[PDB]
Amino acid sequence: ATAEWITGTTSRNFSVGREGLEYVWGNHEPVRVWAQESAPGDPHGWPHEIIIHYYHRHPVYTVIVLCGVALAILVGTASSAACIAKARRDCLTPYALAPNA
Amino acid sequence: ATAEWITGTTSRNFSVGREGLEYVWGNHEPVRVWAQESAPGDPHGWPHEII
Amino acid sequence: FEHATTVPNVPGIPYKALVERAGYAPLNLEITVVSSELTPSTNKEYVTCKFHTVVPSPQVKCCGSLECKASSKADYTCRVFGGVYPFMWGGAQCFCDSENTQLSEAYVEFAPDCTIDHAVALKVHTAALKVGLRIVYGNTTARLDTFVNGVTPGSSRDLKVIAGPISAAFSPFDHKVVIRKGLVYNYDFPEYGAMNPGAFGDIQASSLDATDIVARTDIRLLKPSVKNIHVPYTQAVSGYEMWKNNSGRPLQETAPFGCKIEVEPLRATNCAYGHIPISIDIPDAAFVRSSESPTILEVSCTVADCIYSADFGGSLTLQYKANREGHCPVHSHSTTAVLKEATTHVTATGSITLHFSTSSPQANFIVSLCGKKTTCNAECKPPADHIIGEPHKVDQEFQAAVSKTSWNWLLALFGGASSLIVVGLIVLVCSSMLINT
Ligand SMILES: *[C@@H]1O[C@H](CO)[C@@H](O)[C@H](O)[C@H]1NC(C)=O
Ligand SMILES: *[C@@H]1O[C@H](CO)[C@@H](O)[C@H](O)[C@H]1NC(C)=O
Ligand SMILES: *[C@@H]1O[C@H](CO)[C@@H](O)[C@H](O)[C@H]1NC(C)=O
Numbered sequence: 347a348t349a350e351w352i353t354g355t356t357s358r359n360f361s362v363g364r365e366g367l368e369y370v371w372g373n374h375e376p377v378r379v380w381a382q383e384s385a386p387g388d389p390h391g392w393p394h395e396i397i398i399h400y401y402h403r404h405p406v407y408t409v410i411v412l413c414g415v416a417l418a419i420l421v422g423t424a425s426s427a428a429c430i431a432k433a434r435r436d437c438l439t440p441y442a443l444a445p446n447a
Numbered sequence: 448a449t450a451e452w453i454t455g456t457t458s459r460n461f462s463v464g465r466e467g468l469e470y471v472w473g474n475h476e477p478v479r480v481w482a483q484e485s486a487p488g489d490p491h492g493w494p495h496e497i498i
Numbered sequence: 499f500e501h502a503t504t505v506p507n508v509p510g511i512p513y514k515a516l517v518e519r520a521g522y523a524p525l526n527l528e529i530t531v532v533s534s535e536l537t538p539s540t541n542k543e544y545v546t547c548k549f550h551t552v553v554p555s556p557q558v559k560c561c562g563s564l565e566c567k568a569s570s571k572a573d574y575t576c577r578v579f580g581g582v583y584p585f586m587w588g589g590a591q592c593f594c595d596s597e598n599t600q601l602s603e604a605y606v607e608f609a610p611d612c613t614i615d616h617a618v619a620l621k622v623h624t625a626a627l628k629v630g631l632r633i634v635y636g637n638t639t640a641r642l643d644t645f646v647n648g649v650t651p652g653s654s655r656d657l658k659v660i661a662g663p664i665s666a667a668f669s670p671f672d673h674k675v676v677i678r679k680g681l682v683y684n685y686d687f688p689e690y691g692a693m694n695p696g697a698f699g700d701i702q703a704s705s706l707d708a709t710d711i712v713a714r715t716d717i718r719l720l721k722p723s724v725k726n727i728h729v730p731y732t733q734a735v736s737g738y739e740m741w742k743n744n745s746g747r748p749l750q751e752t753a754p755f756g757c758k759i760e761v762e763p764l765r766a767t768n769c770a771y772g773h774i775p776i777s778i779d780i781p782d783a784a785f786v787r788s789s790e791s792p793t794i795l796e797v798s799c800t801v802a803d804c805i806y807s808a809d810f811g812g813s814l815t816l817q818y819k820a821n822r823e824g825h826c827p828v829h830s831h832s833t834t835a836v837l838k839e840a841t842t843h844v845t846a847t848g849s850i851t852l853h854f855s856t857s858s859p860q861a862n863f864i865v866s867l868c869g870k871k872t873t874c875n876a877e878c879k880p881p882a883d884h885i886i887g888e889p890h891k892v893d894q895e896f897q898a899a900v901s902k903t904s905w906n907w908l909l910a911l912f913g914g915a916s917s918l919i920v921v922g923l924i925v926l927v928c929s930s931m932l933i934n935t
Contacts, residue, residue: 347747347751347752349747349751362885364890364894366756366889368756370751378756378887378889379885379886379887380808380885380886380887380888380889380890381884381885381886382807382808382881382883382884382885382886382890383806383880383881384880384881384882384883384884385880387880388879388880389859389880389901389903389904390859390877390879390901390902390903391903393907396901396903396904396907399880400904411908415908415911415912418911418912418915419911419914419915421915422914422915422916422918422919423915423918425918425919425922426918426919426921426922427922428922429922429923429925429926430922430925432926432929433925433926433928433929436929436930436932436933437929437932455735456696456734456735456740
C-alpha cells in the first residue's frame with residue numbers, strides 16, 4: 347500500500363501484476379486493473395522469440411530452464427564422447443600391443 | 448552539550464556516566480542526575496556472571 | 499445426485515461444472531460467488547476520545563486546613579496549597595493574613611463532542627466466511643448464503659449446498675483493532691486499566707454514557723504564583739489526538755487480497771484468498787434422461803483467432819449433425835480454457851460459435867457438446883493490450899503455459915542428450931561384450 351499527497355502535475359509508475367492493483371485517486375471510486383501477459387515476443391516461433399517472451403514473463407524460471415537444458419546437452423555430449431573414447435580404447439588396445447597384426 | 452528545540456510529545460535518550468548529567472527543560476531550574484554501576488550479572492557468584 | 503467441486507473465492511468469474519450421471523443427460527452448473535463476508539467475533543474493551551479536563555472552583559479555608567477527600571472521578575487529583583492569598587476582583591478574598599489552605603481539584607471528563615469522534619477498541623479472535631452463491635442448473639436459478647465451515651448447509655430450501663473448509667485462513671484484522679468513524683486500524687491498544695499518558699488509551703470507559711471513567715492523563719498541579727486566583731495545571735497532550743496525528747493508513751487502503759473493510763458490523767467484504775470445496779446435492783427433478791436430450795452424431799470444432807487473456811479472447815465454431823432440435827449444454831473439459839456460454843441450442847446440420855478464455859499459448863482442450871467430446875487444437879497469440887479491467891478467469895499451470903513449439907524444442911534437446919547417452923551405453927555394452935568373449 348502506497349499513499350502519497352500529490353500537488354501539481356506529475357507521473358507515477360505502478361507495477362501491476364496478475365493479482366491486480368487497486369488505486370484510489372482523490373474522492374473518485376477505486377479503479378482496479380489486472381496485468382495480462384503481453385511480453386514482446388511470439389511463443390510460437392523461433393527459439394529466441396520464445397526465450398525473450400518467457401524471460402519477460404518469468405525471468406528466473408526461463409533462465410533456470412535454459413541453464414538446465416544447456417547442462418543437459420553438455421553432460422549428454424561429454425558422457426557420450428567418453429563412452430565412444432572408452433569403446434575405442436577397449437577395441438584398439440589388443441591391436442596396439444602388436445605392430446604386426 | 449546537546450541543545451534542541453522540541454515541539455510535541457517525544458522521547459529523547461541521553462547517556463550519563465559516573466560524572467553526571469545536568470539538563471534544563473525550558474524555563475525550569477536545572478536537574479542533575481547521576482549514574483551508578485548497576486549492570487546485569489553478579490560480582491559474587493558464578494564465573495560467567497562476573498565476566 | 500451429489501457433486502463435489504472446488505471453486506476459487508473470486509467475486510464474479512462464474513465457475514463451470516458439468517455433472518454427468520450414468521443414465522442421464524449431462525447437466526450444466528454455474529457456481530458464482532456474488533458476495534463474501536469475513537465477519538469476526540468482536541468484543542469491546544473500551545472507548546476513547548479527546549478529554550475535557552475540567553477544573554472546578556478551588557476550595558479555600560483561611561487559618562484552617564483542607565486535607566482533601568478521595569473521589570471516584572476520572573484521574574482525580576486533589577492537592578493542598580499553603581501560604582496562599584486569594585484575590586478576585588474587588589479585593590483580597592479572605593481574612594487570614596498568610597496561613598491559608600487552598601484545595602485545588604482536577605479531574606478529567608469526556609468532551610461534549612465525543613459522541614461522534616470516538617475510537618472503540620475491539621478484540622478479534624477468528625473470522626468465518628459467509629458467501630453468497632448464485633448456482634444455476636437446468637435453466638433454474640438459486641441465490642443462497644452459506645457459511646464456509648464444512649457443516650452448515652446454508653439456505654437449503656430446495657438445493658443442499660455445503661461449503662467445505664477453505665484452504666487458507668486469512669483474517670486481515672490482527673488481535674487488537676481500533677474503529678474510528680468507520681475507519682479500521684490494527685493498533686496495539688493497551689488493556690483495560692493498563693493506561694499510559696500521552697498515548698492512545700489514556701482515557702477509557704465501557705461506554706460513552708458510562709460513569710466509571712478511568713484515566714491517567716499525567717496531570718500535575720502547580721503552586722500559584724500571581725496574586726489573582728487560578729488553578730495552574732500542566733497536563734500531557736491527548737493521546738487520542740496524537741494517535742489521530744500518527745494513525746497511518748487504515749485497513750480500507752492496506753488490507754491484502756482487496757478486502758473492503760466495512761463497519762456495523764466489522765467485516766471484510768469481496769476478496770479472494772483461497773478455494774472453497776462445495777458439495778451440492780442436486781435434486782433428481784433437475785436431471786433429464788439421455789433419451790430426452792438430442793444426441794450428436796458428428797461434430798468438429800475449429801477455433802479462430804485465439805488470444806489468451808483475462809477477457810473472453812476465443813471464438814470456436816462447432817459444426818454438428820444432430821437428430822432433433824433442442825437445447826442442451828456445452829462444456830470445456832480443461833481447467834485452462836473455460837467457455838462463456840453454458841447451454842446452447844442444437845437443431846440439425848448447423849454450426850454454433852462460442853467464446854472461451856484461456857491462459858495457455860496453445861488451445862488444446864476438449865469441448866463436450868451435449869455429450870460428445872472433441873479436441874480443439876491450435877495456437878493462441880499473446881495480447882496487444884497490456885492492462886485489462888477484469889480479473890483473470892483461469893489460473894496458470896506450468897504444463898499449459900508452455901507452448902507446443904517450446905515443448906518441442908525442450909524435448910528435442912532432452913531427447914538428443916538422452917539418445918547420445920543411450921547410444922554411448924549401447925556401444926560401451928558392445929565393447930564389453932567383445933572384450934568379455
Ligand atoms: C515509468 O515507466 C515507463 C515505462 O513505460 C518509463 O518510460 C518511465 O521512464 C518511467 N518513469 C519513471 C518516473 O520512472
Ligand atoms: C532509548 O533507549 C531505549 C532503551 O531500551 C530504547 O528502547 C529506545 O529505542 C531508545 N530510543 C531512542 C530514540 O534512541
Ligand atoms: C503532527 O501534526 C503536525 C501538524 O503540523 C505535523 O506537522 C506532524 O508531522 C504530525 N506528526 C508528528 C509526529 O508530530
